[PDB]
Amino acid sequence: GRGSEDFQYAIDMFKKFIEEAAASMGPEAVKYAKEFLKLLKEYHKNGINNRLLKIALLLLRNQKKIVDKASQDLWRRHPELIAPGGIAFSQRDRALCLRDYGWFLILIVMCLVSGDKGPIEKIGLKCIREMYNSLGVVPAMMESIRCLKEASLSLLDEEDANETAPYFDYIIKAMSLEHHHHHH
């Protein structure tokens, strides 16, 4: 692991995310993410919003801490996820939970630096549909992003949390509609 307070750190975090998730999000989404990365660098040439980059870095350096804290909260509130017959019982499946947890955070950070829910509309909404095609309707999943939200916002002040909270709310609402309107 490695943390940094530079713009190159956030760029590298997005690059590694594009590489790791390319096969999962599909080709239309990696094109969106590649264009996003090119545009953020172009506008960085004209000066970046320091408050947004500060919140973005703070969540990025503590990504694994947030992932571990949220996953621990989720297993406690819903032990059926890791129990036999659960979706995260298998060590590979549980590792995939933590992977998507860190991926969900990257999407949150992509919205922070841009101040727009665009990356969650394009990449997030499509991946939630594909994630439910492979998993199915598991009611404990609704508490997933809540644990991620509570674990991320606990590292921010009230002003920074108010800036980040809408993107978590947007994902939870989207998961809610995908959850209860999937087989319809």
Ligand X SMILES: C=CC1=C(C)C(Cc2[nH]c(Cc3[nH]c(CC4=NC(=O)C(C)=C4CC)c(C)c3CCC(=O)O)c(CCC(=O)O)c2C)=NC1=O
Q: Would you tell me which residues interact with ligand X (CB under 6 A)?
A: 21, 24-25, 81, 87-88, 93, 96-97, 100, 103-104, 107, 123, 127, 130-131, 134-135, 144
Closest approach, Cβ 45 to ligand X, in A, equals: 26
Tokens 């499946």, residue?
93
| Smallest separation (angstroms) from ligand X to the CB of 65 | 17
What whole-number distance in Å separates Cα of residue 141 and Cα of residue 175? 9
Residue (60 or 123) nearer to ligand X, CB: 123
Of 111 and 123, CB closest to ligand X: 123
Q: Which is nearer to ligand X, 24 or 62 (CB)?
A: 24
d(CA 10, CA 5): 9
The residue number with the shortest CB distance to ligand X is: 97
Q: Are 168 and 148 in contact (CB under 8 A)?
A: yes
User: Quick one: DSSP state of residue 124?
Assistant: I
Rg (CA), the chain: 16
Determine how many CB atoms are found less than 10 A away from the CB of residue 168: 22
Q: How far is the CB of 4 from ligand X (least distance, A)?
A: 22
